[PDB]
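Note to self: the last two entries modelled the partners one at a time, which told us nothing about the interface. This time every component goes in together.
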Amino acid sequence: KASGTLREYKVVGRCLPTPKCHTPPLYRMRIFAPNHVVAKSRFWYFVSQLKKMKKSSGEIVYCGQVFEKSPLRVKNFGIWLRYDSRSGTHNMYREYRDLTTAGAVTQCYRDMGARHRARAHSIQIMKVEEIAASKCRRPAVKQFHDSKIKFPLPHRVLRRQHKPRFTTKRPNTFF
Amino acid sequence: FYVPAEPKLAFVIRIRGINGVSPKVRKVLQLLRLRQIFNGTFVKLNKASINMLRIV
Amino acid sequence: TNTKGKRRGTRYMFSRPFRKHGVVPLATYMRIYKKGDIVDIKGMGTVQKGMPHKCYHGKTGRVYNVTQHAVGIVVNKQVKGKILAKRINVRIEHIKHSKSRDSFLKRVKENDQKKKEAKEKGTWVQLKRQPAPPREAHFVRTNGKEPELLEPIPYEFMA
RNA sequence: GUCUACGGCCAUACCACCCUGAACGCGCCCGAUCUCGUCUGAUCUCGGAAGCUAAGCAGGGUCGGGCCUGGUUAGUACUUGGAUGGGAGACCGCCUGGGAAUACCGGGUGCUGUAGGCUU
RNA sequence: GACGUCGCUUUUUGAUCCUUCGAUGUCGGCUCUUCCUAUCAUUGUGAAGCAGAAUUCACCAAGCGUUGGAUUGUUCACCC
RNA sequence: GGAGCAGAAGGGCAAAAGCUCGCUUGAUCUUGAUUUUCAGUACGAAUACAGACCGUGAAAGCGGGGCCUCACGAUCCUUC
RNA sequence: GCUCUCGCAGACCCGACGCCCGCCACGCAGUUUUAUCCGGUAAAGCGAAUGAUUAGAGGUCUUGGGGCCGAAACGAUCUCAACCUAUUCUCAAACUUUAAAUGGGUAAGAAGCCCGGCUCGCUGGCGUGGAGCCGGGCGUGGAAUGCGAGUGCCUAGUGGGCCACUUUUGGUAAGCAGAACUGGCGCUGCGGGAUGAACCGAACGCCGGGUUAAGGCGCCCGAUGCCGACGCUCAUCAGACCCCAGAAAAGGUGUUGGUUGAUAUAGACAGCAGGACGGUGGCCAUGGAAGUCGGAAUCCGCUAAGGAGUGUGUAACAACUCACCUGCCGAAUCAACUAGCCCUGAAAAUGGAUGGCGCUGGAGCGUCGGGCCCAUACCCGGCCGUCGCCGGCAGUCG
Ligand SMILES: [Mg+2]
Ligand SMILES: [Mg+2]
Ligand SMILES: [Mg+2]
Ligand SMILES: [Mg+2]
Ligand SMILES: [Mg+2]
Ligand SMILES: [Mg+2]
Ligand SMILES: [Mg+2]
Ligand SMILES: [Mg+2]
Ligand SMILES: [Mg+2]
Ligand SMILES: [Mg+2]
Ligand SMILES: [Mg+2]
Ligand SMILES: [Mg+2]
Ligand SMILES: [Mg+2]
Ligand SMILES: [Mg+2]
Ligand SMILES: [Mg+2]
Ligand SMILES: [Mg+2]
Ligand SMILES: [Mg+2]
Ligand SMILES: [Mg+2]
Ligand SMILES: [Mg+2]
Ligand SMILES: [Mg+2]
Ligand SMILES: [Mg+2]
Ligand SMILES: [Mg+2]
Ligand SMILES: [Mg+2]
Ligand SMILES: [Mg+2]
Ligand SMILES: [Mg+2]
Ligand SMILES: [Mg+2]
Ligand SMILES: [Mg+2]
Ligand SMILES: [Mg+2]
Ligand SMILES: [Mg+2]
Ligand SMILES: [Mg+2]
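The predicted structure of the combined assembly is written out below.
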């Protein structure tokens, strides 16, 4: 499974109706995927690990993108995940600040790849929820929990280093 | 929930070349009439056709 | 390396199943075989007379000749790059019939009666069989209740 | 509802122990003249019918042992095909499909063919 | 540093048979240059069961030096 | 069946294929077909039949060697 | 070569013009599907057989040893045994109840179906059974997908192979030796892997345009000269991309993330400090305690909290006075694991190799985006030839 920016889907599925149980139960997952094809694939993966159910003897009765409920309010997100290193597998709890749930999960994927060299096929996201400010554990979010927060932008590195490529004056980094 | 009908028509495209191909894959691709690269066609989807797509 | 003996490598295939030794049941002797029908070749090992070769074990042929205790069978054998029809004399403890051809014959008779009834009643009915079509759009009732939320489990090391 | 004779599948039918068996039957049983066999009429063969269900046999039982069939084990183990996946390797993860077997927990415990009997 | 266990090296000997059989002169010494470091000495150090003297264990380090003979064709060896 | 079935091992086998008696010589005379190795050549080994003459058993049957998988040999010449 | 098959379409014309509806060839296949058999590998099992193998527990018999006071009925019943029973630890290429995935065979109709009749020296209770033969009627051509087939003669070269994924035998291993399966190289150029028979992409007539694959885009060198995204990492041997061309066990208070536990306003942790100790050293041991000692030990202290000390190198009364708190200090701290990058572990011979230069707000590592670059691959077009249509033209019929 590759990436991009992720979307959250809810995928609801069931086993196929045999003439023993004419109404098999429905199951629902929240799945963070680049698109709905990857969403259905990851659904069948997870539900096959959990229940004895395969894509052949089953169906997707619904696969639909969950939109962000409040995409203009900055939320804290707690991610409960498991992954596996080159050695055995580990449980983990991360915290992020974002506007969207899928944005925070994408942030978690790039962060796990950065800090633990973990690939997306190694990561399994098992819980994601919206944390308030007073329930957070990580200092990288609790330092932004301040109502009168204030900081400068100290060392502004020039970015247009090629427009111009040859100038006569050296750039300034204080602004 | 409304589960729509799983489709009866597929468009298939051969997207790999002809070098170093298994004989069973070769036979299935030429039964699909995909003898060149980027060489698509229409198939009708049932169990037999879906299983030979799963082969190739 | 290895020998060209006639029963080389037949330690398990010419043996009996577990708790199935001893006397051969008599229905296997009182089956009948007319020349032309399809038989499976297995080759039990309680009887050592007329037993087929290990290349013919697990095969299927048709009867061309009936004798007192055995049957001449025409079987396809694949020598290196050709398939050729071998004629083997095998005994009735080593053969049994073929339910595939039996099923085909009963659907032939069903087709014939169906075409007769369609012709007399003045309709057109389907006679061929079609390979498992797609799945015919339908509604799935939730019966009021919400579908249960599934969720991957944490990792714990037991074993 | 059963039984004899001959069976078919060959333990759901076996094994261990306990209870019940009306009527026909099947036996146990009585005997050695003949037939025929023995060291021995115990076995086999023959000739019977005083007694008997004690036994065989049948049916039932046992938180029975086995066996049969499900669940669980477990979408686990293993595996088809794929990758310029990971890892120094050993091996491991994923994608696409298939998918077991113990331990443990249920339920069951002979069906049936042909011919001939008994059961008011 | 016992029982164990992880390595490196190609100055030992094997294992292999890829190159060479219309030929790559086959042991040792002599001579002469250069390289390496897994440092014997010397320079600068740290440690000691380093009081001194002597020695031992490490580190940076290959700049510089590492001999004369008896016996043996000897490489090795052994002695003065 | 944990024994035995001539021997190596594997398979098979219980009123058997084992053990003990009784009677015998199907370990005989013949033509073809087939399988095994295979080039679908031969030998060897084997499997179904068919035609004689027999053995055994009350009989159905079984038997042309050894319960099955090994135990063997062209042309030319000699001999019967 | 041959035997067939599809059929050519009606001058230019124009799917058709026969009999409500309906039908659109046969066979074949390195393929699936539907049925139906076959198998003993992977796995699993050993409270299932055969072998192998670890440990306790419970019982009553015996050529168990014996067991102390029983010679005297070992008055005895115990210690140990064997043995039995129910469990338990771990195994099998030449074990196995069970048992896959992938796989092997067969079938999926006109050579079929169903009616009559006849022949037989085989078979026989029978008009039997079986086989053969002569007539007759039934086409919805009886799964999917693809495809033109069959058939004969003559025949060269080859019979040293090698490599790769997976499986696998011998070997410590090998660019070693030997197999299975598929693909390649040989016999094959081209784009990429700097370089390379075999890797990755893709197979090639001669060209123009477009676009791609694998691979890339600081400069060599086409393309990021994006105001690219988020992090990680400093190396006095950094790192830098399939095969592949170089490293492990073990460590790090280097930094980053995580898991679990613990302490703290009845005031943590670290520092400023007071009593911070006693009969009893009871016991231990006088080669060692009226503190601090190899042994078994371990209490009450007359206490805001104190030992049979972890503090004061001891036979020593040595004896300074830490352990435990209350007054300051007033809010977080500590520990054990874990895995990312970096470091140590880490030594070879001419001077040298992420390809080089160099690169550290990356030109490094991980997860990603939008652009862009170009192969003999793909698309469109041109031209050459080959093959096929057994294609068209004898109607020069103003
Ligand atoms: Mg390729
Ligand atoms: Mg061999
Ligand atoms: Mg052998
Ligand atoms: Mg025989
Ligand atoms: Mg039971
Ligand atoms: Mg799967
Ligand atoms: Mg050599
Ligand atoms: Mg070689
Ligand atoms: Mg030479
Ligand atoms: Mg030369
Ligand atoms: Mg020369
Ligand atoms: Mg020279
Ligand atoms: Mg050094
Ligand atoms: Mg100098
Ligand atoms: Mg006779
Ligand atoms: Mg005869
Ligand atoms: Mg085998
Ligand atoms: Mg195994
Ligand atoms: Mg065992
Ligand atoms: Mg040669
Ligand atoms: Mg090799
Ligand atoms: Mg050559
Ligand atoms: Mg070729
Ligand atoms: Mg090539
Ligand atoms: Mg190249
Ligand atoms: Mg390279
Ligand atoms: Mg071009
Ligand atoms: Mg480049
Ligand atoms: Mg450029
Ligand atoms: Mg390093």
